Amino acid sequence: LAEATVALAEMLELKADPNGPVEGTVIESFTDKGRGLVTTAIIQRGTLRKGSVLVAGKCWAKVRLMFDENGKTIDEAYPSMPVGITGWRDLPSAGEEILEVESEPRAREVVDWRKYEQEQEKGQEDLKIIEEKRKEHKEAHQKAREKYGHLLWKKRSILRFLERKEQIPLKPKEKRERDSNVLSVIIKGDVDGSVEAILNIIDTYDASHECELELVHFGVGDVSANDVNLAETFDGVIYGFNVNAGNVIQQSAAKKGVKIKLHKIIYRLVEDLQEELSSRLPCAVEEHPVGEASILATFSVTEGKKKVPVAGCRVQKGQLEKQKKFKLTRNGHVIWKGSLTSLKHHKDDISIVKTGMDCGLSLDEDNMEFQVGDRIVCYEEKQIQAKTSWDPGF
């Protein structure tokens, strides 16, 4: 395999100019506490040396240190060489091309022109959204104005005063309560590529109806006070991926009630993400039929000066229990859902009537009409832990 790889490379006839402004690509980008913002990159054209000014997307740098996989400083990075680069004034995205520029003011000029272009593209997108909000409002305004003619505004407020005397609106609280089924997550990762992987997994969420997943903030590096403050602000959960949280940060989270969930494996961090979503979900009640009894005769009993309709029923299959909930069935239709007010058999109250036992049934709802042939199906309701429908593909 080593021979085959060498043979094919020679057939490819790979060649790159080793002089001139350096070109490259970022393979990884991460934050080091001592060395700062560091990007692992591969050179593609030119030779990189200390003091080279580099631009990569919206981040520029002046090469401060060049190191290899083992950390030993390298003086030059010829084409097709792996090289960690320090000196970045902002963290480049992974996969971003690297270009060398004449000077730092030129680098800042190049970055200022890339940021502006990004702001114009966002501005054009925002314009369509704003034009939609502003078109809807202008219709509601023209409609309410044209409700009356183009009369003197004093009259329109007076004519509206007639319909303002009929108006009583309620103002909704400016700050509204986040619903229980809403999971806010802060994603912190060791490297930028690891964070993008978790963010693509959070973009495969399709169960928004049952519960909503909100991404408050994402970043690279260890958990920080801002992450704890952002989690406390939105009642979110911090998920760390190959990152650490110090005692000061962990203690602050305890006081603020934030939950830091440091992981080291991506299938572990997704399983835990699904466990928190499941908790938010509503408890799925499980209805188990307990018994069934058909009504026969309807009686009107006078107790306490109140006429109580009593449904005489014969238990056919199963048994009926006072605690277990009931429902009324009419020729297949479901008429009622509730619990009996009084279960009384042969002038004696019996909690559990067995199969074939006669029992008079009175409901708490007086509007329920009892016929000769109605059916009643008793059932037991048990809440069951509901698991998130969202599957991440692994």
């Binding site: 690509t25 792996p82 590529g193 991506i266």
Partner: protein
């Protein structure tokens, strides 16, 4: 014409034939989970990193400048095989010159082996 002047830095035009000097190849080890990508890389790196991992899963893309016994130097990009790291595999295929597809004989082609092949076709890199 009150529009911001273009001040972007663009890639230099393709190098002249005279300037072009031979360079080392960039290779990427692509494949499916637990098909031996890291173990194969370790034998040529002459260092064992598979045991020194959390779960024995590669979750990062690392470029190592290996020096072959003949005296050639090759750069190995060890890509992750898990389904989550689809973006890492595409980025590796865009900076590589050759793709070493590790298809385990016992299991054969898998979901991520086809994905690795697709990334190579888009990048148009010999496999």
């Amino acid at each position: 014409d009150k529009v911001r002047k273009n001040k972007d830095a663009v890639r230099r035009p393709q190098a002249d034939p005279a300037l072009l000097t031979p360079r080392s190849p960039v290779v990427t080890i692509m494949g499916h989970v637990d098909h031996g990508k890291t173990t194969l890389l370790d034998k040529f790196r002459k260092t064992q990193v598979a045991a020194v991992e959390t779960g024995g899963i590669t979750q990062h893309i690392g470029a190592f400048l290996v020096s072959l016994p003949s005296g050639e130097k090759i750069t190995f990009l060890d890509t992750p095989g898990h389904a989550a790291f689809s973006a890492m595999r595409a980025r590796g295929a865009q900076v590589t010159d050759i793709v070493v597809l590790v298809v385990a004989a016992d299991d054969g082609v898998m979901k991520q082996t086809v994905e690795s092949i697709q990334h190579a076709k888009d990048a148009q890199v010999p496999i």
